[PDB]
Structures are given as structure tokens and as C-alpha cells.
């Protein structure tokens, strides 16, 4: 992270689509260097339906430019998410920040 | 006196830490405190030995830009950690060192399976994490011994084996600093105080010692100061090829003797000998021209001195 | 308040320190200025242009 | 330019102002031992040629 | 291009790997020269080997 | 305006290893004679004694041929220029050393 | 294999004059070309034995700036030509020589009193000139034994005239680091090393002299 920064970090980390971001609160189910899986929170669930959500990770993917792509997870095992909080970094993001 | 210089000793020694230490010299007459602190400090940054992991195998995986089940590091994040981990060897210049583990939960440096030729000195260095509890991990580690910095690029294998570039400084940071003395009845001597920074894999004292030795080995040079492979079958002799009698003896009549005599001699000088036909010359052309060689070559530096 | 920020962290106010030679251990004779900055690696890559 | 322009400059009070000096060579001397400044106000004998 | 500080005025730093390409019929005409290779293939294949 | 690059072929090769060869004129086109006589699957593709003809001269041999044709086939890849497949293999064998067991 | 370092083992000596001399060693380690050099340099500047003039008293004088009459130079001139001189003392640590002379012409080092323990390495040396042929000069010079450089303005009766004592016999050292490679290795050191002296020692003894100094303070650790 920069560590001298301007505060418009974590709008451009989150607002360009290479991190993984919680769609709906809960709690870490399962966490691996290549998936998450959140235990969905009940007031949060749609009836008749089994509250999971599963975030498959891209994991040194080639780019336009011949880079690499890769996230990396940032949550530990069974620890509350809320809707919106970041989960996974992507390049040049450290904990939801732009990091370049 | 003028020529009676009094001859630095080591004093004491204090252990702040298991990886900070502090040694004192004393006396040292006026001016030598910088020019050995200067000398002893890029000494000590440079070139003390150490021990460092060279090479992992871990059971599932085949390179280094994939993911094992069950593990929350990558094979990558796991690498940066081993080249991290410090290890005390005693007895050899190689070892090989295995870890198996299983369940939830950190794996660090103490799960190493026990060996009596190695030391872990920081026992809680994590190494990786296991979040599932039907995942296991095992992997063998090589450590050697040596000095400096050796990338694994400068240095088949079988797929599986996963290089790491190796550290073997066990030297962190030093410093120095010069204060006055209160010696016995004089007010010119100084003292030098060593502050050593390690992984803790060194003792301070044979540092020290080590690397005055070095220094001394390079002085003595300034303390006593003073002042054709050619191709095999260019060397072979000339009755190695079949040839005839006749061309033989012209031959042997010009003082040629090898095949490398015979190779400088072009087609003109050759014709222009006695007792030697067309014939002969192209006989002696077909003959050369079986083992890929023809008239008219030059050489520098030749006949060698066999 | 960077110089007040650098006094929370005991540290010269001016950000200057004095700096000695690695080669020779003598002291620079004027105090330099000594801090982090943020680089950047472009992607301009002299394996690509030889 | 900045180097030459440094170490051509005189200061009104330096480390070892206003001592003569056998020629250059003693000036470096001095200099490369802490004994003199670089910018002390002396007075050298020179050799030159025309 | 980089800075050589410790250069001469007529004096220029080129990489070898760059001065190996370039010089490559004068390194195949020297090594000839010294009976090192018999051949114009033989000097092909130690230079490629980069012995 | 698209246009296409040279190509090297294998008679390309052949007349450049010629060239950075110590021959006379008259072996130099003995070999040039040689080389436009090859294949592309690597082998003489006519009798010397068509090579001789088309040379254009009574004062040459035909020995002379047969030693150009040999300096020819030692050249890269070795066995190239042969007049059939027992010449070829042979070419080839006189290349190993006699350390090789069989 | 982890306790061996490369050693020099070309090592050059140029002779410039019969006290300048050049010094050319590698291959060496990365980086001991600097360690060597400072060292050697530091201890050749700094602590040396020899010696020295330490101060002057001339009966006509009793000021450094006091006037001489039938002589061409100053006081500070005739000062400046004491510093330079080079002398041997085989005998003791503090020995006093005279000098007298009258008549015209250069005042040399040849003119000073002969003595059984102090030498004088160069008599073609100037001391001063005689400019009339009714002047004369008589003075007295203290020659001590040291190490170094002691500046005559830190040791701060009458007619006493303080010299800086210039006990080192070097006059001049430096040296430069160059880049020197094995057949394979190629980020190795050259050391070049050029010195002048004053002509009490050659070169390459004080060279020696300096190496042996900082190889003896070494020998508590050395191992």
C-alpha cells in the first residue's frame, strides 16, 4: 500500500471489478487459496433456497498485455461479512486498495 | 614509544537478544578505531557462511504458479516462506529435512521432523495454513551451506522439484562506534563498540574472529609485496592416411610429416614437386576429402610446441 | 504538521540526517535528505528493446 | 560543474585557516586527514609554467 | 543507453551478447585461423554452443 | 503493399557451405554442377558421369569428381549427396568413433 | 570451499622516479578492492614513523615575522624550506643540529654540521641564499622522532619559531579501483595503488611497512 496516499484508493480498487466483493452478508464457510464460500445470513435468504454463496478465484490468468493475473484471498475462517466488504484482492490491490 | 603500538584485545560481550549483540575492543591507539571499523563491517556484510534452502519437493505439486486443497497460501507465498526459515547445521555441508502435518490450523518451523545435526532457532515461523481438516501436507526440504547471494537462475530436473534463490548472509546489520577509553594513566587510547544485528544462526565472537582471519589473509600478499590447441587430427602423422607408395615417398621427400604440414600446402606448391603426377595429387585430395579436410588451409602458431 | 508528525515519531524536524560512506565510513560534510517514496516499474523492459 | 564550483569556494572562518603550505600535495594531505577544510583560506607555494 | 562514469572519452560500453551477433563472420574467420575449427559448420556449432 | 521474405533451402545451405570452402575454379564448378544435381530428400540424383558431361571440358577425370563429390558429402548434414541409401549409411558411420560398441 | 577467497596473482610494480611508484594486484573479491586501499591509505596518512624538524631559533630573529638582512627569502620562505627537508636518525629520539654560514650564494643542506647519528638524504636541498658578501646566518634546528602530522598551531621563550612536523616519509597516496574478471567470473577488483615519498624509504618498503602494522593488530583475533 501506498502509505502515503490521497483517500481515493479503495473507490478505485473496488469500483473496477478485480477484487471479489461480498454480494450479501454472513460468515466464512470455507476459505482456500482458489474459493470462498459464505454461509449466507437468514434475513438476508429468499425462501426455499439453500444460503450459500461461492466466489471462484482467477488464479495466473494471462492478460491483454501478457501479464499475470491472480486474487488472493483476504478473509480468514468463520469471520462475519457484510455486503459490499472485499474478500479477495486482485493485482495491485492490498486489502482493498490500489497498490501500484 | 613511537614504534610501541598497544594491540587491540576483545573486552566484553553483551547478548541483548538472541539476534542482537554488542563486542567491545580495547585499546586502540589514535585513528585505527574507524580504519578497523570500516574494514570489519564490510567484512561482516559480505562475506560470512550460512545456511539456506535450496530446493522443496511437496507431494501434489508440479509448479510453482498453482494451489493446493485445503492450503490458504499459494505454492509461491509458501516458497518466500521457506527462504525465510533459519537452520544451524553441524555436522555436514547438505541435509535434507522433511515435514508432514495435517488438520486446521498453522503449520510453522516446529514441525519439522526432528534431525541431531540441526537446530531451529525460531521454532513459531509459519509456513503456511491448513483450513480444511481433511487436508494434509508433507514436502522435503535441501538446505546447504555456503555465502553470499546465489539465484536459482544462475544455477534434468524432474518435474516437481521447485528451486529457491538462495540468502546464505546470516548477517543482518551492523554498526560502529568509536569512544575514548579510561585506561589506566593515559587519555589518547579509544575503544570500539560492534553492534551486530543476525538471524541468530552465528556466534558474535567467531564472527569477529572470522573475519579478522580473512582480513589477514588478504594483508599477507601486501606484507610480502614482489613481482595451439589445435583440432586432434591436425597432430596426427600423415602414414595415418592409405596412401599410396609413391605418394608416400613424395611426400616424405618434402619434409611433410603430419597432417597438419600437409593441409597448409596448396595445389600449385604440390604440382610443382618432382615425382608427383596428377594422379597422385588428386589421390592425395580424394583421401583428405574423406575425413573432411581439403588443401589450402592456414594455420597461425603453427607446429605446436609437441 | 509533517513536522509535528515527525516529532511524534522522534525524528529530525528539518528530515535531514547525516549519512556516512560505505566505501570509506567518512561522514558526508552536509546533511541529506533521507525518506521513502512510492516507485513505480514501468512497463518499458530492456529484455524487450535489445 | 556542481563539484568543481564546491570545492573552489572559500569560507570565512574554516578548519585550519591561515597556515603555509609546502605545495598541493601537503594540501591533499591535510584534506584527506580531517586536519584542514576545503574551503580554509591558506597560503601555497606554486610552480608554474609559462 | 546508461551513464559509464568511469569511461574514456573514446571509449563506449557494448553488451557481449549484442557483440557476439554482431561480430559473428569475424569470430567464424578467427577461429578458423587457429585450427581450433576444420570446418565452417564446426565454427557454426561452437559458436552457437557459446563454448 | 504486402511482400514475402527469402527462404533458406537445403541446396541454399549446400551452395553457401560451398562458397566458405578452399576450392579451385574448376572444383568450385564441379560442385556447383553436384549441388544442382541433389534432391531435397538428400541424395545425387544422376550418374557422375552426367556431371562430367555437363562440366564442358576433356582435360578433367573423373577421380577429380570423385574427390569433390566426397568433400561434397561430408558437409552439413553429413550423408547428404549420396548415391544410394548403403553410400548414405556409410557416410553416416564413418562419422562415429570406434569406441561405439556395435 | 566457503573459507577460500581468490588472492592476487598478478602483481605489477612501475617504476615512475626513484620515489613514485605504481602498484597493480588482481584478481581480487568484489568489493576488497575498497577495503584494502582505504585501509592501507589511512594507516600510510596517518600513523608512520619517522622523523622530523620541530621547531627553529635563529639569534637574529625573535619573531616570525622579524626581518633578516643578506638574505634573499623570509623568515616563512626559510621555514617552508626546513619542513621539506629529509633526514635518518639511527641513534636517539630528539638530536639539536647547527648551521653557520657567510659569503654569497645558495645556503644547501651540505652546509649543515656534520654528526655521527643524523643523515641527510638529499644535500642538494636549499635552505636559503646569501645575497651580500658581509652577511651570515647561524641558526639552530631541533629534529625529534614521531608518527604522522602534527600541526604547529595545536601546540599554541623568545625567539622560538614552531614548524609543522611532518614525521611520515609519504608525500603522496592514492589509489583506484578497476573492473578485473576470470575467465568466468567477471565482476572481480584490480587495485591500483600510486605513491610518492620523500626519499627516506622506497615505495614499496612503506607499503610493506603499512601491511605489516595493520597485519600485527590483528594478531589477538586471527585465528
Not at chain 2, 567467531?206 to 595451439?228: G, H, K, S, W, Y
Not at chain 6, 549446400?14 to 530428400?41: G, H, K, N, Y
Request: net charge negative; proline share 5%.
Amino acid at each position: 500500500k501506498p502509505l502515503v496516499g490521497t483517500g481515493m484508493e479503495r473507490a478505485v480498487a473496488v469500483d473496477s471489478g478485480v477484487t471479489a466483493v461480498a454480494k450479501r452478508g454472513g460468515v466464512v464457510q470455507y476459505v482456500d487459496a482458489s474459493r470462498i464460500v459464505i454461509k449466507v445470513n437468514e434475513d438476508e435468504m429468499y425462501p426455499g433456497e439453500a444460503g450459500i454463496d461461492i466466489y471462484n478465484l482467477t488464479k495466473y490468468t494471462r492478460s491483454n498485455q501478457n501479464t499475470c493475473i491472480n486474487q488472493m484471498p483476504c478473509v480468514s475462517l468463520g469471520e462475519p461479512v457484510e455486503r459490499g466488504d472485499v474478500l479477495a484482492d486482485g493485482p495491485s490491490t492490498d486489502l482493498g486498495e490500489l497498490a501500484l | 614509544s613511537v614504534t610501541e603500538f598497544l594491540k587491540p584485545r576483545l573486552v566484553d560481550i553483551e547478548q541483548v537478544s538472541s539476534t542482537h549483540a554488542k563486542v567491545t575492543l580495547e585499546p586502540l591507539e589514535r585513528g585505527f578505531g574507524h580504519t578497523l571499523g570500516n574494514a570489519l563491517r564490510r567484512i561482516l556484510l559480505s562475506s560470512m557462511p550460512g545456511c539456506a534452502v535450496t530446493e522443496v519437493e511437496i507431494d501434489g505439486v508440479l509448479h510453482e504458479y498453482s494451489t493446493k486443497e485445503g492450503v490458504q497460501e499459494d505454492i509461491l507465498e509458501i516458497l518466500l516462506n521457506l527462504k525465510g526459515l533459519a537452520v544451524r547445521v553441524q555436522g555436514k555441508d547438505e541435509v535434507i529435512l522433511t515435514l508432514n502435518k495435517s488438520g486446521i490450523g498453522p503449520v510453522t518451523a516446529a514441525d519439522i521432523t526432528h534431525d541431531g545435526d540441526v537446530e531451529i532457532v525460531k521454532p513459531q515461523h509459519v509456513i503456511c495454513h491448513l483450513t480444511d481438516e481433511n487436508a494434509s501436507i508433507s514436502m522435503r526440504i535441501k538446505v546447504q551451506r555456503g555465502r553470499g547471494y546465489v539465484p536459482a537462475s544462475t544455477r534434468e530436473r524432474p518435474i516437481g522439484r521447485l528451486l529457491v534463490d538462495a540468502c546464505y548472509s546470516p548477517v543482518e546489520r551492523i554498526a560502529y562506534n568509536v569512544e575514548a577509553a579510561r585506561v589506566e594513566q593515559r587519555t589518547d587510547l579509544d575503544k570500539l563498540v560492534i553492534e551486530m544485528e543476525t538471524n541468530g544462526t552465528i556466534d558474535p565472537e567467531e564472527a569477529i574472529r572470522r573475519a579478522a582471519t580473512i582480513l589477514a589473509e588478504q594483508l599477507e600478499a601486501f606484507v610480502d609485496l614482489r613481482d595451439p590447441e589445435f583440432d586432434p587430427i591436425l597432430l596426427r602423422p600423415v602414414d595415418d592416411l592409405e596412401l599410396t607408395v609413391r605418394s608416400a615417398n613424395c611426400l616424405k621427400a618434402e619434409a611433410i610429416h603430419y597432417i597438419g604440414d600437409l593441409v597448409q600446402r596448396t595445389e600449385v606448391e604440390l604440382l610443382k614437386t618432382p615425382n608427383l603426377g596428377k594422379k597422385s595429387l588428386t589421390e592425395i585430395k580424394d583421401v583428405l576429402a574423406s575425413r573432411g579436410l581439403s588443401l589450402g588451409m592456414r594455420l597461425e602458431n603453427w607446429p605446436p610446441a609437441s | 504538521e509533517i513536522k509535528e508528525l515527525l516529532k511524534l515519531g522522534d525524528l529530525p524536524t528539518s528530515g535531514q540526517i547525516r549519512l556516512y560512506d560505505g566505501r570509506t565510513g567518512e561522514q558526508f560534510e552536509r546533511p541529506v535528505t533521507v525518506g521513502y517514496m512510492y516507485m513505480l516499474k514501468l512497463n518499458h523492459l530492456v529484455d524487450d528493446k535489445m | 560543474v556542481l563539484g568543481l564550483y564546491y570545492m573552489t569556494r572559500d569560507c570565512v572562518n574554516a578548519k585550519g585557516e591561515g597556515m603555509v603550505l609546502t605545495g598541493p600535495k601537503e594540501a591533499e594531505r591535510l584534506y584527506r586527514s580531517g586536519l584542514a577544510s576545503l574551503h580554509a583560506r591558506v597560503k601555497v607555494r606554486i610552480t608554474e609554467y609559462e | 543507453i546508461t551513464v559509464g562514469p568511469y569511461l574514456r572519452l573514446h571509449q563506449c560500453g557494448l553488451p557481449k551478447k549484442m557483440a557476439l551477433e554482431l561480430f559473428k563472420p569475424f569470430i567464424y574467420g578467427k577461429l578458423e585461423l587457429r585450427g581450433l575449427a576444420t570446418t565452417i559448420k564446426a565454427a557454426k556449432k561452437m559458436v552457437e554452443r557459446e563454448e | 503493399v504486402y511482400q514475402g521474405e527469402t527462404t533458406q533451402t537445403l541446396q541454399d545451405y549446400l551452395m553457401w557451405q560451398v562458397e566458405l570452402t578452399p576450392f579451385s575454379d574448376t572444383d568450385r564448378a564441379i560442385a556447383t554442377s553436384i549441388v544442382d544435381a541433389v534432391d531435397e530428400t538428400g541424395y545425387l540424383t544422376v550418374p557422375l558421369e552426367d556431371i562430367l558431361e555437363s562440366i564442358g571440358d576433356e582435360e578433367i577425370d573423373i577421380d577429380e569428381v570423385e574427390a569433390v563429390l566426397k568433400r561434397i558429402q561430408r558437409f552439413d548434414p553429413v550423408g547428404v549427396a549420396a548415391k544410394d541409401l548403403r553410400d548414405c549409411l556409410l557416410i553416416q558411420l564413418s562419422q562415429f568413433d570406434k569406441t561405439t560398441p556395435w
